[PDB]
Every structure is written in structure tokens, then in C-alpha cells.
Amino acid sequence: QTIKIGAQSMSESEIIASMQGQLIEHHTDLKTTTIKNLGSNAVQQQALMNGEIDIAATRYTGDALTGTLRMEPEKDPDKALALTQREFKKRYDLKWYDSYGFDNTYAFTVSKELADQYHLETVSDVKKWAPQLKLGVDNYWMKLKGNGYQDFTKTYGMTFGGTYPMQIGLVYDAVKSGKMDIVLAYSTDGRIKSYGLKMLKDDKQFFPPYDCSPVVPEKVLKEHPELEGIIKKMLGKIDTATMQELNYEVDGNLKEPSVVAKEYLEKHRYFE
């Protein structure tokens, strides 16, 4: 105490951070606080190693494997998760837990209308139309090194009419309003379904798995043996469809992540 729980700048990260916090406080005498607006993955990793945070609420296997670990790329979600867990324990004395039950992947996304008009189901379907299209992307994907824009341009070999970086939160309205024709969205965003959008299949498997787990140093788990059993209550409980809905409560309906987390915990009676 106090258990410091870290969140990056994503609704789901704040929701999940609040969930664990409230859960910990529901079941034990531990106090918690949330550290929000954490930056890049390297920044988040550094916070975990020095003590700025005691629990990382949301980490994604794909980011850890290619970014933090710099490992041989792995296409299979279960093998990627197992490798990530063993290397985090061996290199960093960190426990990467099993997944909450959801993955949050980059996903090329269009309106249902434009999908019908251009006959789009897969990312390769976009290839022949690309020179006429405007693509909106987040603020870091253009310069991202492993599975960023450069490597996309080599693997799929299409070049867009224009490329437009912006706060990820804005891409959903950008494509829905027709200001962008296609966007690299995040798959857990509830605005995809609610705005009548459609995710295109990554037929080449350019993107690695991105299953989401909490991460805690073995030091912290030793000093607070009650922590393990509480975190375990959340594992496998939140699938992608469910995370999308929780996200929409924040992004679309403007509710506080803490309120959304509480209402979810109340529904599930705090997992006993």
C-alpha cells in the first residue's frame, strides 16, 4: 500500500485499471490509486521496472514481443503469450498474467456503405483502390518500426492517396463522416459497431496477436500475497465484444471509466 495501478491513454486501460482497483479494495484492506496518461510502451515498461507503478493494468503481447523483447515474430496467439510470459519472468522478474479474454488489434476499418461499394472483405481487397483513398491513422503508426507504416507498405504493397495521422479517438468520426475513406482503428472500440463500420480481415497476418493481460512484478506479489487471487478473478472474463461495449459506455455515452467499472463489478457481484 498504496498499490499504484498504471493506465495508458485508452478508455479500456482506464476502465480496467479502475476495475482492478475497485476489486482489490472490495476484497482486501489494500488501498489503490490509478496513474493515468502513461505514454509509449517503453515509457510504461520503464515505470513498471522502477516503481512508478505496481501493476500495469493493460499490456498487449504483440507490443511486448516486437517492442520490449525484440523477439522473433510469432503469429500464433497462444505461443506468443507463452513466450511473452516466460521471457518477462526470466529477463525482468515480472509476471505477465493470462489474458483478460480480449485482444485489441490494429484493424483497417471502413463504413459498411463503402465496403459494399468497393467490395471489401480483406485488406488485400483494398490494394487496387488504394491510390484514390484517404487513410487515417493514429499518432504513432506512421513511424512505428515493427508493424508500422513502412513494413505495411512492403508486405501488402499498396500505396494510399494520402495518409493522415491524428489522435486515435478521432478516426471513428473521421471515417463515418467521409472525411477519411479508411482508418487503422483499434478492434476493441465500440464505435466500430455503433457507427455502422466494418473491420477488414488481415489476410496476410501482417499484425501479430494483441491479447491483453495485467502485469505485476514478483516483488509486489511477494509483499502482498492476497493480490494473486484477486487478479485471477478477472482472467478470461472479458471477451472482445464485451470490452467494445464497456468502451462505448465511456466513448459514446460519456460515462466515467470508474462508473463503468463499478457498474460492471456490481453486475458480476465482484466475482463472489
- In whole angstroms, give the CA distance from residue 272 to residue 260: 19
- In whole angstroms, give the CA distance from residue 130 to residue 148: 17
Same domain, 61 and 39: yes
- In whole angstroms, give the CA distance from residue 234 to residue 65: 23
What resolution (Å)? 1.9
Q: Strand order of the sheet with strand 182-186?
A: 162-165, 134-137, 182-186, 106-111, 197-199
Same domain, 155 and 135: yes
Structural domain span for residue 85: 1-104+210-272
Bond into 28 cis (ω within 30): no
The secondary element (H helix, E strand) that includes residue 109 is strand 106-111
Domain containing residue 61: CATH number: 3.40.190.10
| Grid cell of 38 as nine digits | 502513461
Q: Technique behind this structure?
A: X-ray
Nearest C-alpha neighbor of 246 from the set 10, 65, 15: 15
Max alpha carbon distance in the chain (Å)? Answer: 59
The pair phi, psi for residue 188, each rounded to 5°, is -85, 5
Instruction: Specify which residues 197 forms β-bridges with.
Output: 111
- In whole angstroms, give the CA distance from residue 62 to residue 262: 29
For the chain, what is the domain count?
2
The secondary element (H helix, E strand) that includes residue 106 is strand 106-111
Choose the final residue of a domain: 155, 183, 209. Answer: 209
